[PDB]
Assembly symmetry: C2
Homo-oligomer: 162 residues x 2
């Protein structure tokens, strides 16, 4: 085997994976705050305690993270994964735009827990304010993650295969 | 002659560690993103984010939630070589999370001022007496862990040509 080209093939696919994985983690943070921070507030002993319907700043954060995610996806350049990247970029804008569209419900300090959940809690009973689009975004990125993850393996399996 | 059998598992293993560390790094980036872009903001239908001062309570809840998640991820890291650098990050992670709880009087309510929020989660702010200082050190601890783990992968990949 050609240990020269395969080395740069592993280095390259790995770099791509890392980039994709970063977007994945950024998504995990939105899931974490949706599941743990909605309707909460810092508590000296238990970390988080109840504080209902003032989720505006928390939504703002989610939004900032979504635009950061969009930024990261646009930064991804890869021949092979190109089609799966554009799919993620598309769903990304859809999610970000739904939040903006729901500005009357999410664009204020006193955002209700119910509305917050409909915007960023992908496992909520109702997802009419963005959570639906978040759910699809996850799916899109996970697909891109699968591909990128395998390209790395394929490149690494050339060190022990014809 | 390079032992392509062991070197392959050496690359696969060190790479897994890197990803785990990189995820924590990314989660840290989300706290920086919301600190720099979401404090004192609210969703706006056209400009994405608009001014909405001093209602940073839910946003801080999110930050807290992300910090505990980070602690959770670091505790999951197991690696002989990086052990010491991991325990350093774990330590700083608790310090940060505990400073937030300690400042519950200022950060534990819906009406958290932009000034106080910046002192808790904006590592580049002039004053860092409510958590920012500790967040800065945490970043440093993780970046150090990132360096090491990033090189161990390089060293394992450079065995294919040395
Ligand atoms: Mg006010």
């Amino acid at each position: 085997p050609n240990l020269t080209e395969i080395s740069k093939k592993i280095t390259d696919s790995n770099a791509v994976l890392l980039a994709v994985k970063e977007v994945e983690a950024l998504l995990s943070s939105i899931d974490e705050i949706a599941a743990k921070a909605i309707g909460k507030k810092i508590h000296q002993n238990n970390g988080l305690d109840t504080e209902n319907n003032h989720n505006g700043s928390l939504l703002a954060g989610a939004y900032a993270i979504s635009t950061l995610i969009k930024q990261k996806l646009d930064g991804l350049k890869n021949e092979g994964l190109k089609e799966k990247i554009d799919a993620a970029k598309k769903c990304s804008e859809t999610f970000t735009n739904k939040l903006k569209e729901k500005h009357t419900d999410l664009g204020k300090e006193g955002v209700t827990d119910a509305d917050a959940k409909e915007a960023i809690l992908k496992t909520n009973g109702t997802k009419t304010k963005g959570a639906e689009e978040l759910g699809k975004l996850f799916e899109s990125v996970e697909v891109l993650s699968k591909a990128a993850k395998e390209m790395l393996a394929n490149s690494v399996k050339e060190l022990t295969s014809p």
